[PDB]
Design a protein around this motif. Structure first.
Motif: not given
Ligand SMILES: [Zn+2]
Ligand SMILES: [Zn+2]
Lengths: 34, 49, 151, 171, 113, 117, 141, 97
Positions: H6-10, H43-51, H56-57
């Motif tokens: 989360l911190e290395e994202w926006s 963007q965060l919700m889609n990125t987290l779900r993709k992960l 991976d994380i």
């Protein structure tokens, strides 16, 4: 390709794989192992 | 036919996986009055075998 | 009955539903839907009664008074009916809906607990769970009554 | 609203001062028994009505001079402490019970006596408003009445009665 | 005392609103002085404890949605001074609104079933 | 009728309290922790809506348009941009006096239009 | 007069008005506090609801005075006021709200989460947000 | 791991935020700890779900909740949360082919 109307047989293959991978008391074994 | 939701995100694997261990040996629990299902769930733990 | 409930919902959403005496707008909408669905269940049951042959063994046990009532015949043959908990239709346990399979702000018959199948035809899973919710009230009330009346 | 069943049997068995639903069944006598409007009149004679139930909105102002008010009401002109409180009354709740601002002002002055005076509009006016002032911390004094008068003062009915229904019985 | 004088002068000043007295062609000072007397002879205390009568008559003569009341003064003052609703029943639009409000509240204060 | 919120002391960012000027007969604002006198420009000090009608439409947010668990209708085209797809739901606000009125949000990004019918 | 918000911090037998808690966390200014409790000053509806709480605490400004006020209500109020202040600081640091960090310098984290709690109390009081259900299984572990 | 991603994202760190900048921005909660702000939650919700779908994380147990009407993202990694498996449906179609 999609699986229409064949889903009765296909709906239970995944359930059987779930109960092969994980038993019925997995929430106990995992908790104690952790 | 006329869209109800059209925005589904997930799907139940099998709707009968809402039942427990003793309640899932009942045949046709959806044709029974629910207290009868509960009573069988209680009695299925007393059946000899 | 389902179409009538849909029309009542349309009138409520359009603010065309007139508040009946004493009741509020939302309370009168709930009363309208309950009235319509009670009429549906009772009428279907009544139609079931007159269709039973003279040799029907439910009728033999109901008209004798030995065991059962015409409402049991109605539920077994025609339709089970509305499932209430604490006297109201099934509440919005989730955020503005009764189960994840329904859409937010859905006051239709099957969205709020009206069982439309009979015990012979079987219950749809959502209404199976709603029937279990309705039936848990009987067990809870029995378990508390036993201890409350003896004192 | 009936609390019947085993709880009622328990309440009766053990005489208690606070049953879950204290109620009366009040039978009417003359025209009040025969006509719904006349019965509604008695219902309003009974149901406890406070200043809050008739109030629409309360606002507190500082009005330098009545002759040149800061709000667009000219009743202050005809009527003859710049710290001002203004209550506006809902006509629906007022005419639910035939309440007149004469009665409202009478009760207000009866409660708060001489030190607080009220300048009421007329019941037909576009907006029912009461202009109220202390007669010589005035801000918190007017706020204190904004709380107490709304929540506590009685305009109609008798205390201890929450609500009163009207009914054509079937039994 | 001048208490009567000033308030009936104000009644006369209320009667003249909109020049309706001039359109009809009637003398309104006599009418105001008689209206105050008609009020006092019912509210017969020297300081007019219920002078709500006089001030409400003034305002309701000045009510621009019921100018017909200002026109009428043919119902004489002796009746005007006593009227319930402060004589605004003649407005016949506020009267209809109050009637419909009463119709509604008759229903919305009843039992549940 | 308005709605008078809080006002802050510029010298210390503490809440201001009203005070009548007994000499020039004007309303001023003051702070208990600072000798800061500034002039009011509203003449109203406190308000309270007892019936408390409030515009739920304003508290609708454009982001709700993407909620997957919300009903969708092209039968009510967007009033602003004409986009057919609209999500509709009830007030969702507790203390709603007595209402089942619907509120619609357009399902088009950067339109974000919320309207009521 | 009405609508005071209090805080029942652990190890404090009595409750304490919130603004004393915030000035104990080192937020002297009312705006520097409210920006943690009302993220949007567009709402006179929000401000006028918390406003009486800001009225009440208009006699506590200095941070250590706030600590002493908290300390006086503590379960172990040592007569020595220095240890009362230390006790209040210990409460606020480690015994109050551990999940938001329990180091001495976490004051801003604890303040933001406490502001979130106060803000949601205000939202529930305004009726803008429905009260939490104690039976929801998302609220159960 | 979630905090690092989360911190290395926006995100904006909660301690580096401008207090007035929280109004038009969603609040992210990891295990209940209000830990950051995000300007574009979609963007965060889609990125987290993709992960999560890749393991991976974000492990499969973690649950990211998106409250739309009240701008709040809540992510839970702690124990004792009861969950069940479901098929994923991105279009009006199963991902299970
Ligand atoms: Zn200051
Ligand atoms: Zn649009």
């Amino acid at each position: 390709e999609i699986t229409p109307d064949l889903w009765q047989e296909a709906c239970w293959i995944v359930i059987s794989s779930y109960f092969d991978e994980k038993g019925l008391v997995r929430q106990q074994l995992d908790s104690f192992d952790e | 036919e006329v869209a109800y939701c059209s925005t589904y995100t997930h799907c139940e694997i099998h709707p009968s996986m809402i039942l427990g261990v003793c309640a899932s040996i009942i045949p046709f629990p959806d044709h029974n009055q629910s207290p009868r299902n509960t009573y069988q769930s209680a009695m299925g733990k007393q059946a000899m075998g | 009955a389902k179409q009538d409930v849909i029309e009542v919902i349309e009138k409520a959403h359009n603010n065309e539903l007139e508040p009946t005496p004493g009741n509020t707008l939302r309370q009168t909408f709930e009363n309208q839907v309950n009235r319509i669905l009670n009429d549906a269940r009772d009428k279907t049951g009544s139609s079931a009664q007159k269709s039973l042959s003279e040799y029907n063994n439910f009728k033999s046990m109901v008209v004798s008074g030995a065991k059962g009532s015409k409402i049991n015949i109605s539920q077994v043959i025609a339709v089970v009916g509305q499932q209430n908990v604490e006297g109201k239709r099934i509440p919005f346990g989730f955020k503005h809906r009764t189960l994840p399979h329904f859409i937010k702000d859905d006051y239709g018959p099957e969205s709020r607990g009206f069982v439309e199948n009979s015990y012979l035809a079987g219950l749809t899973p959502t209404e199976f769970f709603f029937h279990a919710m309705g039936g848990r009230e009987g067990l809870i009330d029995t378990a508390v009554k036993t201890a409350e009346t003896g004192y | 609203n009936v609390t019947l069943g085993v709880p009622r049997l328990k309440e009766l068995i053990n005489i208690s001062k606070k049953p879950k639903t204290p109620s009366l069944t009040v039978f009417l006598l003359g025209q009040s028994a025969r006509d719904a409007e006349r019965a509604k009149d008695i219902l309003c004679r009974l149901e406890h009505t406070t200043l809050r139930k008739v109030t629409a909105n309360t606002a507190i102002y500082y009005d330098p001079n009545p002759q040149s008010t800061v709000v667009a009401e000219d009743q202050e002109w005809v009527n003859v402490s710049p710290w001002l409180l203004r209550v506006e009354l809902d006509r629906k709740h007022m005419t639910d019970r035939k309440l007149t601002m004469e009665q409202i002002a009478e009760k207000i002055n009866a409660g708060f006596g001489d030190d607080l005076n009220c300048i009421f509009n007329d019941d037909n006016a576009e907006k029912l408003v009461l202009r109220i002032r202390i007669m010589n911390d005035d801000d918190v004094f007017l706020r204190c009445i904004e709380s107490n008068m709304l929540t506590d003062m009685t305009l109609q009915g008798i205390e201890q009665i929450s609500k009163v229904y009207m009914h054509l019985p079937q039994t | 005392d001048s208490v009567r004088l000033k308030c009936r002068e104000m009644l006369a000043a209320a009667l003249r609103t909109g020049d309706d007295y001039i359109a009809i062609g009637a003398d309104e000072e006599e009418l105001g002085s008689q209206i105050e007397e008609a009020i006092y002879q019912e509210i017969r205390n020297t300081d007019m404890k219920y002078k709500n009568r006089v001030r409400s008559r003034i305002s309701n003569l000045k009510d621009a949605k019921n100018p017909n009341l200002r026109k009428n003064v043919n119902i004489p003052p002796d009746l005007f001074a006593r009227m319930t609703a402060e004589e605004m029943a003649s407005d016949e639009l506020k009267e209809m609104r109050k009637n419909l409000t009463k119709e509604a509240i008759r229903e919305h204060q009843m039992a549940k079933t | 009728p308005g709605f008078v919120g809080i006002r802050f002391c510029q010298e210390c960012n503490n809440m201001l309290y009203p005070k009548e000027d007994k000499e020039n007969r004007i309303l001023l604002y003051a702070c208990r922790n600072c000798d800061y006198q500034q002039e009011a420009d509203n003449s109203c000090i406190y308000v309270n809506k007892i019936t408390h009608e409030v515009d739920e439409l304003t508290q609708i947010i454009a982001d709700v348009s993407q909620d997957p668990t919300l009903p969708r209708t092209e039968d009510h085209p967007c009033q602003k941009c004409g986009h057919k797809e609209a999500v509709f739901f009830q007030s969702h606000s507790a203390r709603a006096e007595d209402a089942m009125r619907l509120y619609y949000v357009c399902t088009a990004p950067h339109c974000g239009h919320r309207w009521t019918e | 007069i009405g609508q005071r918000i209090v805080a029942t911090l652990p190890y404090i037998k009595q409750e304490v008005p919130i603004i004393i808690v915030f000035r104990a966390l080192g937020f002297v200014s009312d705006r520097d506090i409210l920006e943690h409790i009302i993220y949007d000053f567009e709402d006179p509806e929000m401000m006028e609801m918390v406003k009486p709480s800001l009225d009440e605490a208009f006699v506590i400004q200095e941070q250590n005075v706030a600590l002493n006020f908290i300390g006086s209500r503590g379960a172990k109020p040592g007569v020595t006021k220095e240890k009362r202040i230390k006790y209040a600081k210990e409460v606020l640091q480690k015994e109050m709200l551990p999940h938001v960090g329990v180091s001495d310098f976490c004051e801003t984290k604890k303040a933001y989460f406490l502001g979130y709690m106060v803000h949601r109390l205000l939202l529930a009081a305004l009726g803008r947000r429905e009260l939490d259900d104690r039976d929801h299984y998302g609220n159960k572990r | 791991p979630i905090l690092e991603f989360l911190e290395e994202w926006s995100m904006e760190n909660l301690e580096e935020i401008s207090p007035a900048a929280i109004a038009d921005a969603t609040k992210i909660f990891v295990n209940g700890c209000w830990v950051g702000i995000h300007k574009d939650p979609e963007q965060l919700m889609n990125t987290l779900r993709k992960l999560r779908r890749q393991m991976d994380i974000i492990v499969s147990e973690v649950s990211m909740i998106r409250d739309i009407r009240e701008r709040e993202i809540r992510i839970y990694t702690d124990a004792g949360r009861i969950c069940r498996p479901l098929l994923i449906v991105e279009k009006q179609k199963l991902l299970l082919k």
